[PDB]
Every structure is written in structure tokens, then in C-alpha cells.
Amino acid sequence: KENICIVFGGKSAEHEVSILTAQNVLNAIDKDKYHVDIIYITNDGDWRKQNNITAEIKSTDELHLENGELEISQLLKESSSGQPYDAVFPLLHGPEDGTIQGLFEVLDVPYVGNGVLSAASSMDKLVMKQLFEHRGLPQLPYISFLRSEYEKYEHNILKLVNDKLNYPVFVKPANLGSSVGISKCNNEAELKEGIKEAFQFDRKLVIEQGVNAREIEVAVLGNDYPEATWPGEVVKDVAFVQLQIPADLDEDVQLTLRNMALEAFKATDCSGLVRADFFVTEDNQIYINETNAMPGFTAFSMYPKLWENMGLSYPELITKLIELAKERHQDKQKNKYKIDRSHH
Amino acid sequence: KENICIVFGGKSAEHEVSILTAQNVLNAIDKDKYHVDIIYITNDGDWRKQNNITAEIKSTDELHLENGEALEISQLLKESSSGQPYDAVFPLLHGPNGEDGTIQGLFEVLDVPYVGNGVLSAASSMDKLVMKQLFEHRGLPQLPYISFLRSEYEKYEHNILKLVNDKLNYPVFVKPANLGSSVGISKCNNEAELKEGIKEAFQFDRKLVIEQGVNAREIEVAVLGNDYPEATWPGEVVKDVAFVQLQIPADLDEDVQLTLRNMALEAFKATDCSGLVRADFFVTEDNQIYINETNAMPGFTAFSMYPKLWENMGLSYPELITKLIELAKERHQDKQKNKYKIDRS
């Protein structure tokens, strides 16, 4: 029997979605196969652990833990069965991405999903776009700069936005995911204001050409030999979850999107999973928008539903993610041995 | 006094250097200005704390090392033995386990202010392929190179070997992308050697870089700052052949030195560094410049390149340590300020 730790909560009011997600995962997890503990990280950063979850959690209130089992390191290094975890499943963004993965790595705890680089890469929209560019994936025109750069080269930068992009454009802090400080700008005065607004939240920005496009998402699962689902659509009458799986798109367009999703996964060197989010215009021009390293993971979110469409049930998906974590961490340690052995 | 913690040792034989660097740093810190705790990470990865270093560390044996207090990872790591939070934590160790970027992640989770590079910059300059991609986007010159995953070599071996031939001039270097360990690096003079060289590197890493090699001079530039970084004049390790005395500034034309200074700033920005970086270039006999790598955690003994480059600029080793602390606090205040505004929208 394998020991699993679900970690959820977090310093933010991504709180409720994190708790809900944990309920879903806990209630889907195969239980005579998995011994399961939970750690609720409160907002204040108190880690509260409950051991050996056996019953269906009927209510989200159950998971707002009060009591806790030790220090952070002790919480993570040992399962309730007295032995290390086979996998820890983070269902929180760490105060951003990549930080909690660092902590797991320092503790040598096996964990689900993306690693440090890939998590942080995907959370920085500029880095992400540069990785996608190098890989040959199509993207909309954009510009990026640092505050230091804007402070010295404003006129030059604002000229770039005019010669290179068509309004409307979006100004987007590079380093959030929260959508704060995003602004749609229809002209240069709006752009100027958008930049000023945004720099109140971040020291680095991307200015992207807007499009009218469908929002098409592909789920990828794996480590070294990832697989991609048929795409799904986030259907919306107005751009500013209702899902259609598979997406109403030509077969050839679906195949291209599946293969680009695999390329996007590789470009940011993902592990475990990624959701690749595209723009597909009414003429079937395809741009990758972003990858999401920690996609919504509720029983009804796009990422699990894309897998269900392929015949991979939600309990089976969670199992697959866990075995991937196990494999990745096993492979890390084995290469350590070979390297150690080389040094000797 | 301000309150500082130095973290050193780690899961490696980086140990002896890391210990010496901790000594140097500690002896460079004015204890009437700073209250200093240290944390040693043993090879098995146990954290051991020694409080309130007040005297010169005349020898390493005066450090307790494994014999400091047994430390769990907890909110406590933010608190000095004075009972004040640390103003800055100075990591003088790598990612034995994980990558670079992992201890930074731990510090961010615990909201500990720390010196130097953040998660993404640390991790990106430790992955040679991401690093190269970032430098290419920034328009910095680099030697020709190819990269691939094991899974890609597995199914496209022929095409890849032919890409090497059609793109790279032999000899080439096979480099694991994710180690700084030099384990699995090899110099390959033809396809036969390359093939061997690839097979061997894949024993240790799942992603490789193949690079056109060049014998050339190795020239380094130090950069210090967060949002308004400054670069040193370049330096070089003194030697007649390219196949521990430094020359600072390097024996290079002034225009070449200036170009390098500015390239170092660009490399700093390309990997979104904080605190510092060392940019390491190749410069050929005809003054062709290629950035080799950035180093997010460059050697930091009293006699190391990074410190000596600043010394030539008039910034003493103690002043350099104080500046890095001040940049650490600044960065962390900036995060706190940003989180507040974000949260309040």
C-alpha cells in the first residue's frame, strides 16, 4: 500500500478552489490502494496535517482543518504509516509557482507535477514565450520589457508597440497568473495607462496583440513520453466551466494542436502534466497562448475532463499522476547513484 | 545590529569549498554591525545551527558543522538567535538535491529574505539549454549548438547525428544540460566519439547539449544589483594556453571590455537575475565574443574571481557582502510591497 499526501490551502484566496479540489481528489483517490494524509496550509502558513483519510469527505467545511499532527520537514518526510511518501500532490500555488517544489526537493519528497524550473518557467510569461519561440510554436506578436527599460526607453518602446502590434493590445504583468494589472488597451493613452497600472504590481511586462479567437485547451500527461488529449473548448459567447469536449474543430486542426501541446510541454520541460491553452481563430490560425503547469483539477475542470474523453477516468488520472511522481523521483535518485558512482 | 544567517555545506563534496567560503564571508562581516547565525547542511541533508558568531573564524575547526543544533525546517528559519527576524539569509551552497533554485524555493515558502538569485533565475542558469535559449532571445552571441531529450535521441538518432554534422564543426562537446558536475561531459572528435559521448551522458541526464567547441580565452564579468545592476571590468585567469592567479582587468582592448560589460548586463537580465551573476565568455584570438554561461552562485571566497572583479572596481569584499545583504532586503521589501498591492486589488 502506497502512502500519499495531499497538500492544499495556501496564503491566498485561491483557498476555496484549493479546498474543493482537495475534496474532489480525496474522494476520487483509490483508497484500498493508497494510504492518504492531508496537509492544509493555512493563510498564516501554519501547516496542519490530518492522517489516514478513509471516508468520503462530504463537505468542504471538513477540510478547513483546525488541529495538526511536527515541523514542516517532519510533516513531509514521514507518512502516517511511518515511512516516506510515495507521492505528495500539491493542490496549491506556492507563495508563486516553483517555490513549494523547491521545498519538496530540499526535503527529498516525491511530488506530483512540474518541477522547479518548469513551474517557474510557466509562471513567467516572458520566459514562457521565449521558450515557445525557440521551439517554433506560433504566438501572437508581443513586446516585453522591464520597468528599468520603460523608465529609460519609453518613447522607443511605445513606438515599437505601434510599428509591431495592432491595437487592441493587452498589457500583462509577466509574473502573475492572477490577472491583476491586465488591461485591454485600445489606443496609446490606454496603453500608457495600462503600463503604469501594471508596474504597480510587477517589474516586468508583456504587451500582446489581442485576437478574436476560440480558447482551445489540450491536456498532456507524462514525464519522458507524454501523451496529449484531443482538444476541448472553453465555450464563451463573450471574451473578457462551460466546456465542449472534444472541440468542434477540423480533425487536422485537432491533430496539430495535440502535437503542439507536446511541443509546449517539452519547451518548458514539464513533468507530470501541463495544459496547453491555444487561440484558434475562425480561419483556424493557431497560436499558443500559454501553458498552465497547475491546471484546474476539480472533477469538472477541463484538464480531468479532457482525460475522461480519452477513457482515462478521474481516479485513474490521479493514480497515473502519482505513479509519474514516483517514477520521476526514482529516476532522479538513480541518476544520483550513477553520478556518485562516477565521482568514485 | 542587523541579523544575518549563512547557510553552507549541503548534500555534496561542494562541502570543503562551501566551508572555506563560509569562513571567508564570516570573517568579512563586522560583528558590531551584524548578528550572524550559521546553518550547516550535512551531507545526509541535516541542518545544524550555530548561533551568534562573534569572533574571527581563525580555522574551520572553530565551526561546529554537524555539531550545531538539530534544526527542523520551519517558520523558525526566519528568526535570528537574537529574537529578531533575519534581514538576509546568505546561501553558500547549491542544489545537491533538485537544482539550483530549490533552496530559494524553500526560502520563498517560509518568506525568508535571501541573497542572490531567485528561483527562476537560479534554476534557469543551471539548465544549460534554457540558459542558451534565454541568451539567444536576448541576442547574445553563442557558439553553435544542438540540444535534445533522451526520448528524441531514442527515435531520431540518425537525424540528430546528421544535424550535428550539418550544423556543428567538430570537435564538439557533449554536455548534460542539468548538471554543473562535469560528470558525463565529453569532447568528441567525430561521429563515433559523439555517439559514445551521447550514450554516456544519458546515463546521468535526460537532456543534452552538443556544442561546437573552441579553444579560446575565458573572460569573466561580475554583476551586482537587482533592477539597476552594475558590471565590473572583465577578468581572466592568467595562463598562456587554453587547451590561482587572475589578471584583472583582463588584457583586452578597451572596446572589447566595454562590450563584455554591457553583454554581462544583458545576460543578467536575460535570466532575470537578482543580487549578482558572473557572466563567463569565450573570446577568441580575433576578438570574437561568445557568452559561455552565467553563474548564479559564483565562487565567493576572498580570492575568487567574483569578489576580486569588484575589488578592482573599488568595492571591498566586506562592502560587497554588505551590498548583497542590502539588495536582499530591498528585494524582499519589494516582494512584500507587491504582494500587498496585488492582494489589495
Side-chain angles (χ1 to χ4, degrees):
Chain A
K1 175 163 271 50
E2 289 179 36
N3 295 294
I4 301 296
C5 196
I6 305 314
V7 183
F8 67 94
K11 296 230 164 211
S12 98
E14 299 177 322
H15 231 48
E16 32 190 333
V17 182
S18 168
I19 295 175
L20 208 222
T21 308
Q23 169 180 46
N24 284 354
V25 169
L26 283 166
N27 290 349
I29 203 177
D30 201 314
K31 265 206 199 90
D32 294 318
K33 302 164 26 190
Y34 285 117
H35 192 75
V36 183
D37 309 321
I38 61 166
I39 301 167
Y40 179 51
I41 314 168
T42 212
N43 311 13
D44 272 282
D46 316 311
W47 292 45
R48 290 163 172 181
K49 194 181 185 173
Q50 172 164 160
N51 300 292
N52 194 16
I53 302 332
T54 159
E56 296 276 290
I57 104 81
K58 307 198 205 179
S59 160
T60 258
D61 300 338
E62 296 189 43
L63 290 182
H64 291 251
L65 307 184
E66 302 181 349
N67 345 281
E69 167 172 48
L70 294 144
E71 298 276 63
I72 297 205
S73 35
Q74 296 163 325
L75 301 193
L76 287 165
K77 288 158 98 200
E78 273 196 30
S79 78
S80 65
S81 77
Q83 89 189 224
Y85 283 114
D86 293 280
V88 175
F89 205 143
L91 303 174
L92 75 180
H93 282 320
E96 336 186 40
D97 253 70
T99 58
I100 199 169
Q101 291 74 23
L103 160 74
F104 298 153
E105 300 256 6
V106 172
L107 299 172
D108 206 22
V109 157
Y111 57 93
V112 175
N114 282 286
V116 175
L117 185 53
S118 173
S121 285
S122 241
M123 206 53 154
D124 187 309
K125 303 331 144 147
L126 185 39
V127 167
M128 177 194 73
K129 291 181 180 293
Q130 299 175 66
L131 301 179
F132 290 160
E133 181 166 278
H134 179 87
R135 198 88 191 175
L137 286 164
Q139 306 187 98
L140 285 169
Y142 76 98
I143 281 170
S144 60
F145 44 89
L146 297 165
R147 202 195 61 245
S148 61
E149 282 161 348
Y150 196 72
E151 297 164 342
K152 303 181 291 199
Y153 307 119
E154 169 172 339
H155 182 110
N156 316 87
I157 285 160
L158 284 192
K159 185 232 61 266
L160 247 192
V161 169
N162 202 344
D163 302 336
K164 312 323 207 48
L165 310 190
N166 294 111
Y167 285 88
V169 298
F170 293 75
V171 188
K172 309 180 98 165
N175 295 287
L176 299 150
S178 61
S179 311
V180 287
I182 302 195
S183 71
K184 176 171 30 50
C185 307
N186 298 333
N187 83 321
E188 195 175 313
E190 288 185 355
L191 205 218
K192 258 198 53 63
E193 222 268 24
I195 294 292
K196 256 254 282 187
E197 295 336 26
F199 275 142
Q200 301 157 138
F201 310 107
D202 206 326
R203 61 198 282 288
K204 178 175 84 170
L205 310 185
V206 164
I207 307 312
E208 303 177 8
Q209 191 173 283
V211 265
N212 292 356
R214 291 201 260 180
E215 180 179 325
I216 303 295
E217 298 184 348
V218 174
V220 185
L221 182 59
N223 283 331
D224 295 339
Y225 310 103
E227 302 280 351
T229 65
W230 295 117
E233 200 171 354
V234 173
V235 290
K236 286 170 176 153
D237 282 341
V238 192
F240 66 80
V241 202
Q242 208 85 44
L243 267 19
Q244 159 187 281
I245 301 160
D248 185 21
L249 302 170
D250 292 340
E251 190 115 42
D252 59 346
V253 175
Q254 295 198 55
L255 287 170
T256 299
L257 288 170
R258 286 180 75 184
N259 286 302
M260 297 189 169
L262 299 169
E263 281 296 282
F265 181 102
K266 286 176 194 168
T268 50
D269 205 25
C270 289
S271 297
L273 82 175
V274 88
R275 198 180 66 209
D277 302 344
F278 297 90
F279 290 130
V280 188
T281 60
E282 71 148 39
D283 139 26
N284 298 128
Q285 289 327 307
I286 293 168
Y287 311 94
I288 190 153
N289 179 26
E290 64 192 9
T291 40
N292 189 338
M294 287 189 68
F297 200 78
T298 227
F300 311 107
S301 307
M302 173 74 90
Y303 184 102
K305 290 293 205 185
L306 285 179
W307 280 114
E308 287 177 7
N309 181 59
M310 305 306 284
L312 187 65
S313 76
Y314 189 54
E316 288 183 308
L317 176 62
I318 291 162
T319 290
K320 173 62 63 181
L321 286 163
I322 291 162
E323 287 306 308
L324 289 170
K326 274 176 59 65
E327 294 176 2
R328 181 165 165 255
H329 181 260
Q330 286 166 357
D331 297 357
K332 167 173 192 216
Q333 299 177 317
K334 280 157 197 326
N335 270 224
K336 190 202 174 274
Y337 179 66
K338 326 284 178 225
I339 297 167
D340 288 343
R341 185 216 177 213
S342 165
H343 283 315
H344 293 269
Chain B
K1 317 183 182 178
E2 287 191 357
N3 283 272
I4 307 299
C5 189
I6 298 173
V7 180
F8 72 112
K11 263 153 177 226
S12 213
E14 298 182 315
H15 251 51
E16 328 287 79
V17 163
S18 176
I19 292 162
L20 174 72
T21 296
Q23 199 187 6
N24 281 200
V25 170
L26 284 165
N27 290 343
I29 286 177
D30 181 341
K31 320 284 183 311
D32 289 329
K33 285 199 29 185
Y34 291 100
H35 181 113
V36 187
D37 295 332
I38 66 169
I39 292 179
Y40 179 66
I41 297 180
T42 66
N43 322 38
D44 292 321
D46 286 312
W47 285 42
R48 302 294 196 253
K49 193 167 181 196
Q50 173 172 4
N51 304 320
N52 199 20
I53 307 290
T54 56
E56 207 196 347
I57 305 285
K58 291 164 178 260
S59 94
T60 280
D61 295 54
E62 298 155 44
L63 305 179
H64 291 191
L65 310 166
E66 318 87 48
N67 302 302
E69 348 158 80
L71 215 65
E72 293 305 329
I73 305 316
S74 70
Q75 278 187 25
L76 206 44
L77 284 295
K78 92 163 62 203
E79 196 181 359
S80 180
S81 69
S82 68
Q84 282 268 125
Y86 295 117
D87 288 299
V89 183
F90 214 131
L92 302 171
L93 76 161
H94 258 352
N97 55 348
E99 214 169 47
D100 266 351
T102 62
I103 200 177
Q104 291 76 19
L106 184 151
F107 296 155
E108 295 267 359
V109 169
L110 300 182
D111 198 34
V112 176
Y114 57 93
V115 166
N117 280 294
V119 170
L120 178 57
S121 48
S124 69
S125 64
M126 196 76 301
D127 179 317
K128 303 160 183 73
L129 185 35
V130 166
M131 188 198 69
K132 289 178 166 317
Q133 300 172 61
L134 295 182
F135 291 160
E136 198 164 324
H137 177 83
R138 193 93 189 182
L140 284 163
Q142 308 178 96
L143 284 162
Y145 77 91
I146 278 329
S147 73
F148 48 86
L149 294 154
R150 190 194 167 99
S151 67
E152 289 167 334
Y153 195 68
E154 274 165 0
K155 54 141 66 182
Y156 296 118
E157 167 166 346
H158 178 102
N159 303 230
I160 297 161
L161 300 167
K162 183 226 201 207
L163 223 210
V164 174
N165 286 60
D166 299 338
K167 300 301 232 176
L168 291 20
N169 286 359
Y170 283 92
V172 295
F173 287 75
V174 197
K175 314 221 164 173
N178 293 303
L179 323 171
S181 334
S182 304
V183 295
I185 292 189
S186 71
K187 195 179 197 205
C188 288
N189 291 283
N190 67 313
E191 188 168 294
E193 271 176 51
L194 177 63
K195 191 171 257 266
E196 306 174 15
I198 290 154
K199 190 174 281 175
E200 290 186 13
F202 276 146
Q203 298 158 340
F204 312 116
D205 202 336
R206 60 192 288 280
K207 198 171 64 183
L208 296 188
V209 169
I210 309 179
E211 192 172 307
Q212 176 171 300
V214 297
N215 290 331
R217 283 212 266 181
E218 157 71 337
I219 303 288
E220 286 139 285
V221 177
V223 358
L224 177 60
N226 289 335
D227 296 337
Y228 305 104
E230 293 285 329
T232 64
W233 295 111
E236 186 180 359
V237 176
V238 170
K239 23 161 79 113
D240 287 337
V241 191
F243 79 80
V244 179
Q245 190 185 3
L246 283 8
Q247 173 64 45
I248 297 174
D251 189 15
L252 291 163
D253 332 58
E254 199 57 42
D255 179 87
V256 176
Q257 292 191 46
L258 296 165
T259 301
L260 291 171
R261 282 183 83 184
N262 280 300
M263 282 185 177
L265 298 172
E266 292 289 294
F268 185 104
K269 295 169 195 162
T271 48
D272 211 17
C273 288
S274 290
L276 75 172
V277 81
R278 197 190 64 213
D280 298 343
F281 301 85
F282 298 121
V283 180
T284 72
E285 17 61 49
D286 59 337
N287 295 326
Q288 291 153 121
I289 303 149
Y290 304 104
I291 186 156
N292 175 40
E293 64 180 8
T294 40
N295 188 335
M297 326 267 258
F300 210 72
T301 79
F303 303 136
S304 296
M305 180 66 85
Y306 180 100
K308 293 279 149 177
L309 282 171
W310 279 106
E311 186 180 299
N312 172 62
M313 308 302 298
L315 192 72
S316 64
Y317 191 45
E319 287 160 6
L320 176 54
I321 291 154
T322 295
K323 174 59 62 180
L324 284 165
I325 287 165
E326 278 313 301
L327 294 164
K329 296 169 68 57
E330 290 178 7
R331 178 146 181 282
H332 183 245
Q333 288 163 2
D334 287 357
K335 159 180 185 213
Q336 288 179 314
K337 277 76 180 315
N338 288 335
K339 169 195 173 78
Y340 179 76
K341 292 149 169 274
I342 291 160
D343 291 350
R344 289 205 71 246
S345 289

PDB file of all heavy atoms in Angstrom, chain B residues 136-153:
ATOM      1  N   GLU B 136      19.901  33.512 -26.460  1.00  0.00           N
ATOM      2  CA  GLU B 136      19.596  33.632 -27.910  1.00  0.00           C
ATOM      3  C   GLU B 136      18.498  34.633 -28.115  1.00  0.00           C
ATOM      4  O   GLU B 136      18.605  35.479 -28.949  1.00  0.00           O
ATOM      5  CB  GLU B 136      19.119  32.308 -28.487  1.00  0.00           C
ATOM      6  CG  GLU B 136      19.185  32.196 -30.033  1.00  0.00           C
ATOM      7  CD  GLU B 136      19.064  30.709 -30.468  1.00  0.00           C
ATOM      8  OE1 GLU B 136      19.605  29.801 -29.738  1.00  0.00           O
ATOM      9  OE2 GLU B 136      18.399  30.471 -31.504  1.00  0.00           O
ATOM     10  N   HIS B 137      17.452  34.582 -27.280  1.00  0.00           N
ATOM     11  CA  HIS B 137      16.393  35.538 -27.383  1.00  0.00           C
ATOM     12  C   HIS B 137      16.908  36.951 -27.129  1.00  0.00           C
ATOM     13  O   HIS B 137      16.421  37.944 -27.719  1.00  0.00           O
ATOM     14  CB  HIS B 137      15.202  35.209 -26.434  1.00  0.00           C
ATOM     15  CG  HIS B 137      14.118  36.238 -26.479  1.00  0.00           C
ATOM     16  ND1 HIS B 137      13.137  36.243 -27.451  1.00  0.00           N
ATOM     17  CD2 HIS B 137      13.861  37.305 -25.683  1.00  0.00           C
ATOM     18  CE1 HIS B 137      12.344  37.292 -27.272  1.00  0.00           C
ATOM     19  NE2 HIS B 137      12.768  37.961 -26.213  1.00  0.00           N
ATOM     20  N   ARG B 138      17.906  37.064 -26.278  1.00  0.00           N
ATOM     21  CA  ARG B 138      18.405  38.396 -25.917  1.00  0.00           C
ATOM     22  C   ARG B 138      19.405  38.926 -26.966  1.00  0.00           C
ATOM     23  O   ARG B 138      19.854  40.087 -26.948  1.00  0.00           O
ATOM     24  CB  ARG B 138      19.009  38.357 -24.524  1.00  0.00           C
ATOM     25  CG  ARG B 138      19.264  39.719 -23.926  1.00  0.00           C
ATOM     26  CD  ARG B 138      18.043  40.134 -23.101  1.00  0.00           C
ATOM     27  NE  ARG B 138      18.230  41.536 -22.726  1.00  0.00           N
ATOM     28  CZ  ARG B 138      17.410  42.253 -21.968  1.00  0.00           C
ATOM     29  NH1 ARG B 138      16.297  41.737 -21.512  1.00  0.00           N
ATOM     30  NH2 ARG B 138      17.711  43.509 -21.732  1.00  0.00           N
ATOM     31  N   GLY B 139      19.765  38.048 -27.882  1.00  0.00           N
ATOM     32  CA  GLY B 139      20.602  38.448 -28.973  1.00  0.00           C
ATOM     33  C   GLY B 139      22.030  38.359 -28.576  1.00  0.00           C
ATOM     34  O   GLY B 139      22.810  39.006 -29.171  1.00  0.00           O
ATOM     35  N   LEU B 140      22.385  37.560 -27.556  1.00  0.00           N
ATOM     36  CA  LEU B 140      23.800  37.459 -27.153  1.00  0.00           C
ATOM     37  C   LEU B 140      24.508  36.384 -27.976  1.00  0.00           C
ATOM     38  O   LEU B 140      23.926  35.312 -28.239  1.00  0.00           O
ATOM     39  CB  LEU B 140      23.900  37.060 -25.691  1.00  0.00           C
ATOM     40  CG  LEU B 140      23.602  38.160 -24.636  1.00  0.00           C
ATOM     41  CD1 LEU B 140      23.319  37.555 -23.229  1.00  0.00           C
ATOM     42  CD2 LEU B 140      24.756  39.167 -24.563  1.00  0.00           C
ATOM     43  N   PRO B 141      25.782  36.631 -28.386  1.00  0.00           N
ATOM     44  CA  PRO B 141      26.398  35.654 -29.259  1.00  0.00           C
ATOM     45  C   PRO B 141      26.843  34.406 -28.517  1.00  0.00           C
ATOM     46  O   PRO B 141      27.410  34.485 -27.407  1.00  0.00           O
ATOM     47  CB  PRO B 141      27.610  36.400 -29.828  1.00  0.00           C
ATOM     48  CG  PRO B 141      27.915  37.361 -28.829  1.00  0.00           C
ATOM     49  CD  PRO B 141      26.699  37.727 -28.064  1.00  0.00           C
ATOM     50  N   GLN B 142      26.557  33.267 -29.127  1.00  0.00           N
ATOM     51  CA  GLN B 142      26.935  31.978 -28.617  1.00  0.00           C
ATOM     52  C   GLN B 142      27.411  31.073 -29.728  1.00  0.00           C
ATOM     53  O   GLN B 142      27.030  31.188 -30.854  1.00  0.00           O
ATOM     54  CB  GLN B 142      25.721  31.290 -27.980  1.00  0.00           C
ATOM     55  CG  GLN B 142      25.001  32.114 -26.984  1.00  0.00           C
ATOM     56  CD  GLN B 142      23.772  31.398 -26.421  1.00  0.00           C
ATOM     57  OE1 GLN B 142      23.899  30.833 -25.419  1.00  0.00           O
ATOM     58  NE2 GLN B 142      22.611  31.419 -27.102  1.00  0.00           N
ATOM     59  N   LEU B 143      28.215  30.117 -29.344  1.00  0.00           N
ATOM     60  CA  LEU B 143      28.718  29.132 -30.252  1.00  0.00           C
ATOM     61  C   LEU B 143      27.587  28.286 -30.777  1.00  0.00           C
ATOM     62  O   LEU B 143      26.614  28.052 -30.079  1.00  0.00           O
ATOM     63  CB  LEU B 143      29.739  28.269 -29.471  1.00  0.00           C
ATOM     64  CG  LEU B 143      31.118  28.921 -29.213  1.00  0.00           C
ATOM     65  CD1 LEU B 143      31.893  28.232 -28.088  1.00  0.00           C
ATOM     66  CD2 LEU B 143      32.009  28.986 -30.468  1.00  0.00           C
ATOM     67  N   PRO B 144      27.726  27.747 -31.982  1.00  0.00           N
ATOM     68  CA  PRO B 144      26.663  26.882 -32.455  1.00  0.00           C
ATOM     69  C   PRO B 144      26.437  25.659 -31.545  1.00  0.00           C
ATOM     70  O   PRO B 144      27.361  25.141 -30.945  1.00  0.00           O
ATOM     71  CB  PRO B 144      27.132  26.515 -33.849  1.00  0.00           C
ATOM     72  CG  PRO B 144      27.956  27.727 -34.283  1.00  0.00           C
ATOM     73  CD  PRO B 144      28.741  27.998 -33.028  1.00  0.00           C
ATOM     74  N   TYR B 145      25.191  25.259 -31.393  1.00  0.00           N
ATOM     75  CA  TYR B 145      24.880  24.145 -30.513  1.00  0.00           C
ATOM     76  C   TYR B 145      23.586  23.489 -30.937  1.00  0.00           C
ATOM     77  O   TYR B 145      22.837  24.074 -31.704  1.00  0.00           O
ATOM     78  CB  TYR B 145      24.777  24.547 -29.026  1.00  0.00           C
ATOM     79  CG  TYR B 145      23.480  25.230 -28.687  1.00  0.00           C
ATOM     80  CD1 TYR B 145      22.371  24.516 -28.247  1.00  0.00           C
ATOM     81  CD2 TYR B 145      23.351  26.578 -28.814  1.00  0.00           C
ATOM     82  CE1 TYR B 145      21.153  25.164 -27.972  1.00  0.00           C
ATOM     83  CE2 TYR B 145      22.153  27.209 -28.520  1.00  0.00           C
ATOM     84  CZ  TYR B 145      21.077  26.505 -28.091  1.00  0.00           C
ATOM     85  OH  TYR B 145      19.886  27.207 -27.868  1.00  0.00           O
ATOM     86  N   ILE B 146      23.384  22.261 -30.490  1.00  0.00           N
ATOM     87  CA  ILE B 146      22.161  21.495 -30.769  1.00  0.00           C
ATOM     88  C   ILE B 146      21.772  21.010 -29.376  1.00  0.00           C
ATOM     89  O   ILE B 146      22.663  20.756 -28.551  1.00  0.00           O
ATOM     90  CB  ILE B 146      22.524  20.347 -31.830  1.00  0.00           C
ATOM     91  CG1 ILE B 146      22.525  20.871 -33.264  1.00  0.00           C
ATOM     92  CG2 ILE B 146      21.821  18.920 -31.706  1.00  0.00           C
ATOM     93  CD1 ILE B 146      21.600  21.978 -33.577  1.00  0.00           C
ATOM     94  N   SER B 147      20.487  20.811 -29.126  1.00  0.00           N
ATOM     95  CA  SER B 147      20.064  20.139 -27.910  1.00  0.00           C
ATOM     96  C   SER B 147      18.977  19.125 -28.143  1.00  0.00           C
ATOM     97  O   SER B 147      18.243  19.248 -29.130  1.00  0.00           O
ATOM     98  CB  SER B 147      19.527  21.156 -26.909  1.00  0.00           C
ATOM     99  OG  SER B 147      18.239  21.653 -27.317  1.00  0.00           O
ATOM    100  N   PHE B 148      18.850  18.118 -27.249  1.00  0.00           N
ATOM    101  CA  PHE B 148      17.718  17.174 -27.345  1.00  0.00           C
ATOM    102  C   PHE B 148      17.511  16.385 -26.084  1.00  0.00           C
ATOM    103  O   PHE B 148      18.368  16.333 -25.207  1.00  0.00           O
ATOM    104  CB  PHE B 148      17.929  16.228 -28.565  1.00  0.00           C
ATOM    105  CG  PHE B 148      19.314  15.631 -28.621  1.00  0.00           C
ATOM    106  CD1 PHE B 148      19.596  14.498 -27.947  1.00  0.00           C
ATOM    107  CD2 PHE B 148      20.327  16.274 -29.279  1.00  0.00           C
ATOM    108  CE1 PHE B 148      20.887  13.998 -27.924  1.00  0.00           C
ATOM    109  CE2 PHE B 148      21.589  15.750 -29.301  1.00  0.00           C
ATOM    110  CZ  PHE B 148      21.871  14.632 -28.593  1.00  0.00           C
ATOM    111  N   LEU B 149      16.303  15.854 -25.965  1.00  0.00           N
ATOM    112  CA  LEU B 149      15.923  14.952 -24.926  1.00  0.00           C
ATOM    113  C   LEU B 149      16.314  13.543 -25.277  1.00  0.00           C
ATOM    114  O   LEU B 149      16.426  13.222 -26.450  1.00  0.00           O
ATOM    115  CB  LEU B 149      14.430  14.980 -24.718  1.00  0.00           C
ATOM    116  CG  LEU B 149      13.874  16.311 -24.190  1.00  0.00           C
ATOM    117  CD1 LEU B 149      12.332  16.587 -24.584  1.00  0.00           C
ATOM    118  CD2 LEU B 149      14.102  16.378 -22.726  1.00  0.00           C
ATOM    119  N   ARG B 150      16.484  12.702 -24.254  1.00  0.00           N
ATOM    120  CA  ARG B 150      16.760  11.289 -24.472  1.00  0.00           C
ATOM    121  C   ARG B 150      15.688  10.720 -25.378  1.00  0.00           C
ATOM    122  O   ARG B 150      16.012   9.999 -26.340  1.00  0.00           O
ATOM    123  CB  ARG B 150      16.782  10.521 -23.154  1.00  0.00           C
ATOM    124  CG  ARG B 150      17.305   9.051 -23.272  1.00  0.00           C
ATOM    125  CD  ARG B 150      16.998   8.221 -22.003  1.00  0.00           C
ATOM    126  NE  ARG B 150      17.177   6.765 -22.161  1.00  0.00           N
ATOM    127  CZ  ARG B 150      18.226   5.987 -21.786  1.00  0.00           C
ATOM    128  NH1 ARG B 150      19.364   6.440 -21.206  1.00  0.00           N
ATOM    129  NH2 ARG B 150      18.131   4.675 -22.040  1.00  0.00           N
ATOM    130  N   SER B 151      14.425  11.057 -25.101  1.00  0.00           N
ATOM    131  CA  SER B 151      13.285  10.496 -25.853  1.00  0.00           C
ATOM    132  C   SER B 151      13.327  10.824 -27.358  1.00  0.00           C
ATOM    133  O   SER B 151      12.847  10.029 -28.195  1.00  0.00           O
ATOM    134  CB  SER B 151      11.983  10.977 -25.270  1.00  0.00           C
ATOM    135  OG  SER B 151      11.824  12.404 -25.461  1.00  0.00           O
ATOM    136  N   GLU B 152      13.816  12.013 -27.687  1.00  0.00           N
ATOM    137  CA  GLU B 152      14.074  12.448 -29.043  1.00  0.00           C
ATOM    138  C   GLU B 152      15.264  11.732 -29.720  1.00  0.00           C
ATOM    139  O   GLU B 152      15.134  11.350 -30.886  1.00  0.00           O
ATOM    140  CB  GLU B 152      14.325  13.928 -29.082  1.00  0.00           C
ATOM    141  CG  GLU B 152      13.065  14.668 -28.811  1.00  0.00           C
ATOM    142  CD  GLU B 152      13.280  16.117 -28.530  1.00  0.00           C
ATOM    143  OE1 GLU B 152      14.384  16.482 -28.060  1.00  0.00           O
ATOM    144  OE2 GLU B 152      12.297  16.845 -28.687  1.00  0.00           O
ATOM    145  N   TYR B 153      16.368  11.540 -29.004  1.00  0.00           N
ATOM    146  CA  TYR B 153      17.526  10.740 -29.496  1.00  0.00           C
ATOM    147  C   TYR B 153      17.164   9.288 -29.750  1.00  0.00           C
ATOM    148  O   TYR B 153      17.642   8.679 -30.723  1.00  0.00           O
ATOM    149  CB  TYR B 153      18.636  10.716 -28.514  1.00  0.00           C
ATOM    150  CG  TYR B 153      19.972  10.209 -29.128  1.00  0.00           C
ATOM    151  CD1 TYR B 153      20.658  10.983 -30.091  1.00  0.00           C
ATOM    152  CD2 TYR B 153      20.505   8.973 -28.771  1.00  0.00           C
ATOM    153  CE1 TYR B 153      21.869  10.542 -30.662  1.00  0.00           C
ATOM    154  CE2 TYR B 153      21.720   8.495 -29.366  1.00  0.00           C
ATOM    155  CZ  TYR B 153      22.394   9.293 -30.307  1.00  0.00           C
ATOM    156  OH  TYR B 153      23.580   8.833 -30.887  1.00  0.00           O
TER     157      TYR B 153
END
